[PDB]
Amino acid sequence: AYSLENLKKISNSLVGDQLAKVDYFLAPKCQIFQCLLSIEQSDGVELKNAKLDLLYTLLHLEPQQRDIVGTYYFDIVSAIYKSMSLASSFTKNNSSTNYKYIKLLNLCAGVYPNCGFPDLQYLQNGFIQLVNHKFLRSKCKIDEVVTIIELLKLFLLVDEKNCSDFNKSKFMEEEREVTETSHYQDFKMAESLEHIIVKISSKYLDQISLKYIVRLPFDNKGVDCTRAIPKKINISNMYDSSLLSLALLLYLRYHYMIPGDRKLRNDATFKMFVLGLLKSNDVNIRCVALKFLLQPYFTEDKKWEDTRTLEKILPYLVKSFNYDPLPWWFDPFDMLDSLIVLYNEITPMNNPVLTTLAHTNVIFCILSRFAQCLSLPQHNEATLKTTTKFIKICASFAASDEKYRLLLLNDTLLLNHLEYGLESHITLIQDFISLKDEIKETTTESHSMCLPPIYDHDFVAAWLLLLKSFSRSVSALRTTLKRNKIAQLLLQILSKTYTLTKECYFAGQDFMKPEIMIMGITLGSICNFVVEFSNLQSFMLRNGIIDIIEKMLTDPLFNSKKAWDDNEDERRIALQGIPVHEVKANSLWVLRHLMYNCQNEEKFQLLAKIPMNLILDFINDPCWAVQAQCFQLLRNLTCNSRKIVNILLEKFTYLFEFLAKKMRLLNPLDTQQKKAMEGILYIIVNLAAVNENKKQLVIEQDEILNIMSEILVETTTDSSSYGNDSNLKLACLWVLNNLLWNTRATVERCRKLVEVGLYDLVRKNITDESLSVREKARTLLYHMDLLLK
């Protein structure tokens, strides 16, 4: 508990002795921690090093010994985070003191990652100054080199709390929020990392060698569509390898946020350097090369149509599955699944990754591994996670290919496991709701709103994604997925998750986010069974899906236009952070599908249960998906009905002004906003096709005709707004056709359409590039010519 010599004696005694280490955590010997945790200036370099060494040795326990020790271990860890001040004097400490301190910090961050660490900025400034003064100028020591390596590891461990935008693409890489006071230091950090990378990697560039043939010498670098990558580049220096790997990973984190030209990622020699690094002997180097080469596909535009680079990188990504010690920051499952989803969602009907994997026998191996994982006799957490990953990747296979849908459904034992998973989750939820009061009473005193999530959530989410992928085909919906058990399980999951949200909000936000996500996915999978020409629509309607949708849509949690009661302030505070937009979008999706190609009897039943004000509560929702689904639901509702059109007119008349403002302000380059625009135009069609009164009312408005003219004047060269879109052109032509079709006011309307200048546009569209627009325009012109006599 004193006496540097005695400190070293205790260290020598303790090295490797878990029993003795545990013995120093009990009543009489705890006094040593009051001396270890108090390191102040002017103690002495040797004494500080001895204290840090002894403290690191003492804290180096296994989990089955931390269980014996208890919460005193974590009190000591928190004391190290809080009541120590070696980070404030990082620039004045000694090198060995800094190294030992950072090593202890890595141990603490590994054993207790939730405790808040308050001195990250001091460490970042120390790293920046150390790199800028010592490392780059070559006047550095072994202690400083190992210190900067440990600092790079510590910086890589940070969770980093990136931003959340609900309107961004769901399959691109998420980036981190940045302010100005942090922006200056971020720029400095990125500059330091880039300088380290350049300095270390500029010693091996002369090792790049490639011989190739161009079909129509050196010092030209003409064309690189070869599929052959340069010879291997090997870094013999181990410290250089560690620095290059860690610095390049952190630079990946930092480099798309720094403005500039002639970036390192867009270089011509560095890309070949990394391609050669793909063949290295060091697994860290290989994985970092994979990350660096695959990032642009998710963080860049138009990069996805560069399939030659993918075709030359894929063999090594497939090889990376087989190496035993993999780093913690590399998951080949996630990388492969991300690529497959990228191509599934940008260009369907053509998946380069799937064709490359299918021609070279890899998909069959993956499916064999999936079956073997499902068939194991004993499972644990590792096997459950591996099975979850396999289910996700198989869902990504089957998402957009009937070939793989039928191939996976030819197993006859897969739906059994799907139903087993759903049943197990339902059982867990029922038990939790039954024990709610006792669980609250027991865990309310310290675990107020911090409770772990149910362990089965990832498994059941993967099963629900797979089902959502299967249910996308009519052959499956009518032959093999025609089981009432699946519909029962989906409805039960919806009901149970909503009840859990209503009653068990005391469990916090970690417990409830997976339940909200499961609710979203199960709605997304129900909205396929609900569509017409599917045998389970009657089952879903008999078993009350509209009632569940109504409960979910009148809730103040999902519907912001509703006010919280006075008993629900606790719920308001507890659940305020969770984002719920997928749930709303999919609820409106289901309603839209229920209203497809139905009669006014069904329409009036749904409007009796869910009124029209409730549907209009979402018309101005900040999320684009909710707006799009509301507009498409309005289209399906107004389709072939005069009563509902009158109701919608009564709810507003400035309806045409509202639609004109929406049409002018929406951005046609967004998929959801373009869907909303199509919905608006076809609402106009369905409104015009009702009566002579409605035809007159639509022709009176001038903004509508201005928008129609602006859409119809677009051509191949003039494509600034609306993108010269055949769907919008056909919608406008349909509006005009309904205005002219069905006999005195019709001729006046024709004359008005001629004077406004739409006759010229219809005659101009006869020479279009799309046959549908050409034929519709010529028929409309013929009818106008007939009525113009």
Binding site: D301, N351, P622, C639, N667, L669, D670, Y682, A689, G723
Partner: protein, 217 residues
């Protein structure tokens, strides 16, 4: 006053966003191949005529490369003579990787029901004046020069019946040609141990002035 205008707080922007994903979704339809169009007509077997009715359910024709094996059309077909209704799927001929002669197709279980010998395909296609005017070792050479099969008057396709629609089918298939400007369907049935060159010809039937849609999640 004007509630839905004064209360508009949706965030409107105008800048070129993250990657433009609005296009390349090749869900192309046709004026007469919409997902709700109806056709009626007759099928002539020997010297007897039966009434037939076709209702289209889904349609998604590819505008570009298409390595996927999802059906291009789908619908219900009802034949009277009692009434037999069957669910059918259809693949369109787009001159690349889905050419005329059945050799050029893939070797997949999905595509193995639409297949016959190239000589049979020739002697069955040659009865269409559209096929004749559009022009077995010469078609393979001259088909590669054709472009933009969707921007043409006639579209050729193959129809195959999978099962019966009320609580799920004869094992032949139809050669079909569709006229894009008048919406006429003309086809021939083929099976190995069947009759020869059974007729089929349909006209649009055509509500039908207002639109309503769906979309698979």
């Amino acid at each position: 006053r004007k509630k839905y205008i004064v209360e508009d707080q949706s965030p409107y922007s105008s800048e070129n966003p993250v990657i433009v994903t609005s296009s390349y979704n090749h869900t192309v339809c046709t004026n007469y191949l919409r997902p709700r169009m109806q056709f009626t007509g007759y099928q002539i077997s020997g010297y007897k005529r039966y009434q037939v009715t076709v209702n289209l359910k889904t349609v998604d024709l590819p505008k570009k490369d298409c390595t996927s094996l999802s059906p291009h059309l789908s619908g219900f077909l009802s034949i009277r003579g009692p009434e037999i209704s069957t669910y059918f799927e259809a693949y369109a001929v787009n001159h690349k990787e889905l050419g005329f002669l059945s050799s050029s197709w893939k070797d997949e279980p999905v595509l193995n029901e639409f297949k016959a010998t190239d000589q049979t395909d020739l002697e069955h296609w040659i009865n269409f004046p559209s096929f004749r005017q559009l022009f077995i070792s010469r078609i393979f050479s001259q088909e590669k020069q054709f472009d933009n099969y969707l921007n043409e008057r006639f579209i050729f396709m193959k129809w195959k019946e999978k099962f019966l629609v009320p609580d799920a089918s004869y094992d032949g298939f139809y050669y079909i040609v569709h006229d894009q400007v008048t919406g006429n369907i003309q086809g021939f049935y083929y099976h190995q141990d069947a009759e020869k060159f059974q007729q089929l010809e349909l006209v649009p039937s055509l509500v039908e002035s207002s639109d309503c849609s769906f979309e698979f999640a």
